[PDB]
Short mmCIF file of all heavy atoms in Angstrom, two decimals:
data_model
loop_
_atom_site.label_atom_id
_atom_site.label_comp_id
_atom_site.label_asym_id
_atom_site.label_seq_id
_atom_site.Cartn_x
_atom_site.Cartn_y
_atom_site.Cartn_z
N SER A 7 -6.82 17.35 -6.94
CA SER A 7 -7.06 16.31 -5.82
C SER A 7 -5.77 16.33 -4.96
O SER A 7 -5.68 15.60 -3.98
CB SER A 7 -7.10 14.87 -6.48
OG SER A 7 -8.18 14.78 -7.42
N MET A 8 -4.87 17.20 -5.41
CA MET A 8 -3.49 17.48 -4.79
C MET A 8 -2.70 16.55 -4.00
O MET A 8 -1.76 16.81 -3.33
CB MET A 8 -3.62 18.88 -4.10
CG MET A 8 -4.23 18.71 -2.74
SD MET A 8 -5.73 19.73 -2.42
CE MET A 8 -7.09 18.36 -2.44
N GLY A 9 -3.19 15.28 -4.03
CA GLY A 9 -2.43 14.30 -3.14
C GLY A 9 -3.19 13.45 -2.15
O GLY A 9 -4.38 13.18 -2.32
N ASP A 10 -2.46 12.89 -1.28
CA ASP A 10 -2.94 12.01 -0.14
C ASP A 10 -2.60 12.69 1.21
O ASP A 10 -1.86 13.60 1.22
CB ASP A 10 -2.27 10.62 -0.38
CG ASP A 10 -2.68 9.96 -1.64
OD1 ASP A 10 -3.90 10.14 -2.00
OD2 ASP A 10 -1.89 9.15 -2.22
N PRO A 11 -3.17 11.99 2.25
CA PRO A 11 -2.81 12.45 3.56
C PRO A 11 -1.24 12.83 3.68
O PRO A 11 -0.93 14.05 3.65
CB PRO A 11 -3.22 11.32 4.49
CG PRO A 11 -4.44 10.86 3.77
CD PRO A 11 -3.83 10.66 2.35
N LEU A 12 -0.43 11.75 3.78
CA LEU A 12 1.07 12.15 3.79
C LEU A 12 2.01 11.37 3.04
O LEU A 12 1.78 10.07 2.73
CB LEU A 12 1.50 12.31 5.28
CG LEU A 12 1.80 13.75 5.62
CD1 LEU A 12 2.44 13.80 7.00
CD2 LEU A 12 2.95 14.28 4.62
N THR A 13 3.16 12.01 2.80
CA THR A 13 4.24 11.41 2.07
C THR A 13 4.63 10.08 2.51
O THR A 13 4.43 9.73 3.75
CB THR A 13 5.60 12.29 2.28
OG1 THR A 13 5.29 13.65 1.86
CG2 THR A 13 6.71 11.74 1.48
N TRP A 14 5.10 9.24 1.67
CA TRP A 14 5.33 7.78 1.90
C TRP A 14 6.16 7.67 3.23
O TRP A 14 6.00 6.65 4.03
CB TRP A 14 6.09 7.15 0.74
CG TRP A 14 6.29 5.71 0.93
CD1 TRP A 14 5.32 4.71 1.40
CD2 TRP A 14 7.42 4.95 0.72
NE1 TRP A 14 5.87 3.55 1.50
CE2 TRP A 14 7.21 3.58 0.99
CE3 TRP A 14 8.74 5.31 0.15
CZ2 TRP A 14 8.15 2.60 0.70
CZ3 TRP A 14 9.65 4.26 0.00
CH2 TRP A 14 9.41 2.99 0.31
N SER A 15 7.08 8.60 3.37
CA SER A 15 7.86 8.58 4.62
C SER A 15 6.97 8.63 5.82
O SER A 15 6.91 7.59 6.57
CB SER A 15 8.73 9.84 4.66
OG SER A 15 8.09 10.89 4.01
N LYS A 16 6.24 9.66 6.07
CA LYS A 16 5.32 9.89 7.22
C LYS A 16 4.59 8.60 7.38
O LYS A 16 4.53 8.05 8.50
CB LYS A 16 4.45 10.94 6.86
CG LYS A 16 4.99 12.22 6.30
CD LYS A 16 5.80 13.05 7.35
CE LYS A 16 6.30 14.46 6.75
NZ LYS A 16 7.18 15.12 7.74
N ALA A 17 3.92 8.19 6.32
CA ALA A 17 2.98 6.98 6.45
C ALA A 17 3.89 5.90 6.90
O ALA A 17 3.41 5.05 7.73
CB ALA A 17 2.53 6.58 5.01
N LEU A 18 5.07 5.85 6.42
CA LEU A 18 6.03 4.82 6.77
C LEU A 18 6.05 4.74 8.30
O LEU A 18 5.50 3.97 8.86
CB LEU A 18 7.42 5.02 6.21
CG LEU A 18 7.67 4.41 4.77
CD1 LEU A 18 9.10 4.71 4.44
CD2 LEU A 18 7.35 2.92 4.80
N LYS A 20 4.38 6.06 10.95
CA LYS A 20 3.20 5.60 11.53
C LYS A 20 2.78 4.10 11.13
O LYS A 20 2.28 3.45 12.02
CB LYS A 20 2.05 6.46 11.19
CG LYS A 20 1.91 7.79 11.95
CD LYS A 20 0.55 8.50 11.73
CE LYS A 20 0.40 9.77 12.49
NZ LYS A 20 -0.86 10.54 12.15
N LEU A 21 3.20 3.80 9.91
CA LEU A 21 3.02 2.44 9.36
C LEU A 21 3.30 1.28 10.40
O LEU A 21 2.40 0.67 10.76
CB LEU A 21 3.79 2.28 8.06
CG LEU A 21 2.92 1.99 6.72
CD1 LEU A 21 1.98 0.87 6.91
CD2 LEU A 21 2.27 3.28 6.31
N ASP A 57 7.99 10.33 -3.05
CA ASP A 57 6.57 10.10 -2.67
C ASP A 57 5.89 9.77 -3.88
O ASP A 57 6.49 9.58 -4.93
CB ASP A 57 6.12 11.43 -2.00
CG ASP A 57 4.72 11.23 -1.28
OD1 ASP A 57 4.28 10.12 -1.19
OD2 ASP A 57 4.16 12.31 -0.91
N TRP A 58 4.59 9.55 -3.67
CA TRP A 58 3.79 9.14 -4.82
C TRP A 58 2.35 8.91 -4.22
O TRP A 58 2.17 8.59 -3.13
CB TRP A 58 4.28 7.94 -5.53
CG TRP A 58 4.75 6.99 -4.52
CD1 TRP A 58 6.09 6.93 -4.14
CD2 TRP A 58 4.04 5.99 -3.78
NE1 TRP A 58 6.16 5.86 -3.14
CE2 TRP A 58 4.93 5.33 -3.02
CE3 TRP A 58 2.79 5.54 -3.91
CZ2 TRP A 58 4.52 4.24 -2.16
CZ3 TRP A 58 2.31 4.55 -3.02
CH2 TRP A 58 3.33 3.81 -2.27
N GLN A 59 1.38 9.10 -5.18
CA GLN A 59 -0.05 8.84 -4.76
C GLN A 59 -0.51 7.47 -5.17
O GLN A 59 -0.26 6.87 -6.13
CB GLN A 59 -0.92 9.84 -5.49
CG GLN A 59 -1.23 11.22 -4.74
CD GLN A 59 -0.06 11.79 -3.84
OE1 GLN A 59 -0.07 11.59 -2.59
NE2 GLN A 59 1.05 12.19 -4.57
N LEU A 60 -1.25 6.78 -4.15
CA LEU A 60 -1.79 5.51 -4.40
C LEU A 60 -2.48 5.27 -5.65
O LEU A 60 -2.25 4.30 -6.27
CB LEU A 60 -2.61 5.15 -3.24
CG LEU A 60 -2.07 5.27 -1.82
CD1 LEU A 60 -1.82 6.76 -1.55
CD2 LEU A 60 -3.08 4.68 -0.78
N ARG A 61 -3.34 6.23 -6.04
CA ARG A 61 -4.13 6.06 -7.22
C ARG A 61 -3.07 5.65 -8.33
O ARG A 61 -3.40 4.83 -9.23
CB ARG A 61 -4.76 7.33 -7.74
CG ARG A 61 -3.72 8.40 -8.28
CD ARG A 61 -4.50 9.31 -9.36
NE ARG A 61 -5.41 10.17 -8.81
CZ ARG A 61 -5.32 11.04 -7.65
NH1 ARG A 61 -4.17 11.07 -7.12
NH2 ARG A 61 -6.18 11.86 -7.38
N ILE A 64 -2.19 1.85 -6.68
CA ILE A 64 -3.37 0.93 -6.24
C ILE A 64 -3.85 0.07 -7.34
O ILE A 64 -4.25 -1.05 -7.04
CB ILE A 64 -4.48 1.66 -5.63
CG1 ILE A 64 -3.99 2.53 -4.39
CG2 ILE A 64 -5.60 0.75 -5.22
CD1 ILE A 64 -3.88 1.83 -3.07
N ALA A 88 -3.17 -1.99 4.62
CA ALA A 88 -2.55 -1.03 5.66
C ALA A 88 -1.94 0.05 4.90
O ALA A 88 -2.66 1.15 4.82
CB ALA A 88 -1.61 -1.70 6.47
N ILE A 89 -0.80 0.06 4.47
CA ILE A 89 -0.11 1.21 3.78
C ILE A 89 -0.98 2.15 2.99
O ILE A 89 -0.86 3.33 3.01
CB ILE A 89 1.12 0.67 2.85
CG1 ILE A 89 1.75 1.90 2.13
CG2 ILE A 89 0.62 -0.48 1.88
CD1 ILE A 89 3.23 1.68 2.03
N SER A 90 -1.93 1.54 2.33
CA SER A 90 -2.90 2.24 1.60
C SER A 90 -3.68 3.05 2.72
O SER A 90 -3.64 4.27 2.68
CB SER A 90 -3.78 1.36 0.69
OG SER A 90 -4.40 0.29 1.46
N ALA A 91 -4.44 2.35 3.45
CA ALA A 91 -5.28 2.81 4.57
C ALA A 91 -4.43 3.88 5.27
O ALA A 91 -4.65 5.09 5.27
CB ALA A 91 -5.58 1.66 5.50
N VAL A 92 -3.40 3.33 5.92
CA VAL A 92 -2.45 4.11 6.55
C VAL A 92 -2.14 5.49 5.86
O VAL A 92 -2.41 6.57 6.32
CB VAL A 92 -1.18 3.34 6.94
CG1 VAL A 92 -0.26 4.06 7.97
CG2 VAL A 92 -1.47 1.90 7.41
N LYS A 93 -1.50 5.30 4.71
CA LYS A 93 -1.08 6.36 3.84
C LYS A 93 -2.25 7.36 3.77
O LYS A 93 -2.06 8.62 3.69
CB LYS A 93 -0.68 5.97 2.51
CG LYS A 93 -0.10 7.05 1.64
CD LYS A 93 0.73 6.64 0.52
CE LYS A 93 1.15 7.89 -0.45
NZ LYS A 93 1.82 8.98 0.44
N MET A 94 -3.51 6.78 3.74
CA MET A 94 -4.68 7.49 3.47
C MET A 94 -5.27 8.18 4.83
O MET A 94 -6.57 8.18 4.95
CB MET A 94 -5.70 6.77 2.70
CG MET A 94 -6.41 7.43 1.55
SD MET A 94 -5.36 8.15 0.19
CE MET A 94 -5.63 9.89 0.29
N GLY A 95 -4.34 8.55 5.68
CA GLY A 95 -4.80 9.14 6.93
C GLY A 95 -5.75 8.34 7.72
O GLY A 95 -6.32 8.76 8.66
N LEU A 96 -5.88 7.04 7.46
CA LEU A 96 -6.71 6.16 8.15
C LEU A 96 -5.90 5.46 9.27
O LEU A 96 -5.44 4.41 9.14
CB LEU A 96 -7.44 5.13 7.26
CG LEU A 96 -8.52 4.22 7.82
CD1 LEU A 96 -9.49 3.88 6.66
CD2 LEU A 96 -8.11 2.93 8.43
N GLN A 97 -5.75 6.13 10.46
CA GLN A 97 -5.04 5.68 11.54
C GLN A 97 -5.77 4.33 12.01
O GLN A 97 -6.77 4.35 12.60
CB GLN A 97 -4.87 6.52 12.73
CG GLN A 97 -4.31 7.90 12.24
CD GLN A 97 -4.36 8.96 13.34
OE1 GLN A 97 -4.18 8.66 14.53
NE2 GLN A 97 -4.77 10.15 12.89
N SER A 107 -11.09 0.18 4.09
CA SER A 107 -10.40 1.41 3.59
C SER A 107 -9.90 1.02 2.15
O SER A 107 -9.93 1.76 1.21
CB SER A 107 -9.22 1.69 4.60
OG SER A 107 -8.56 0.56 5.09
N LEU A 111 -10.55 2.55 -1.51
CA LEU A 111 -9.33 3.10 -2.20
C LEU A 111 -9.22 2.44 -3.59
O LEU A 111 -8.69 3.12 -4.43
CB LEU A 111 -8.19 2.97 -1.30
CG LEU A 111 -7.32 4.24 -1.06
CD1 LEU A 111 -7.58 5.27 -2.14
CD2 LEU A 111 -7.66 4.84 0.24
N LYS A 114 -12.28 3.42 -5.96
CA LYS A 114 -12.15 4.87 -6.31
C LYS A 114 -11.01 4.95 -7.23
O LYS A 114 -11.29 5.42 -8.38
CB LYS A 114 -11.76 5.65 -4.99
CG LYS A 114 -11.53 7.13 -5.21
CD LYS A 114 -11.84 7.90 -3.95
CE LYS A 114 -11.68 9.44 -4.27
NZ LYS A 114 -11.81 10.19 -2.95
N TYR A 115 -9.73 4.72 -6.97
CA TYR A 115 -8.68 4.92 -7.85
C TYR A 115 -8.47 3.74 -8.86
O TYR A 115 -7.57 3.90 -9.64
CB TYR A 115 -7.36 5.12 -7.17
CG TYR A 115 -7.37 6.36 -6.31
CD1 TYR A 115 -6.96 6.33 -5.03
CD2 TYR A 115 -7.66 7.59 -6.91
CE1 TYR A 115 -6.76 7.43 -4.17
CE2 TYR A 115 -7.60 8.65 -6.04
CZ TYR A 115 -7.09 8.65 -4.74
OH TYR A 115 -6.94 9.84 -3.94
#
Side-chain angles (χ1 to χ4, degrees):
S7 302
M8 81 239 106
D10 290 326
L12 247 183
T13 304
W14 188 43
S15 35
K16 316 285 188 182
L18 272 183
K20 283 191 177 176
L21 241 310
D57 188 8
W58 39 269
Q59 268 37 252
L60 302 64
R61 74 153 66 53
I64 301 278
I89 177 140
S90 47
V92 192
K93 184 160 177 56
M94 228 57 246
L96 192 148
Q97 301 171 47
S107 44
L111 233 332
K114 181 153 184 186
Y115 296 131

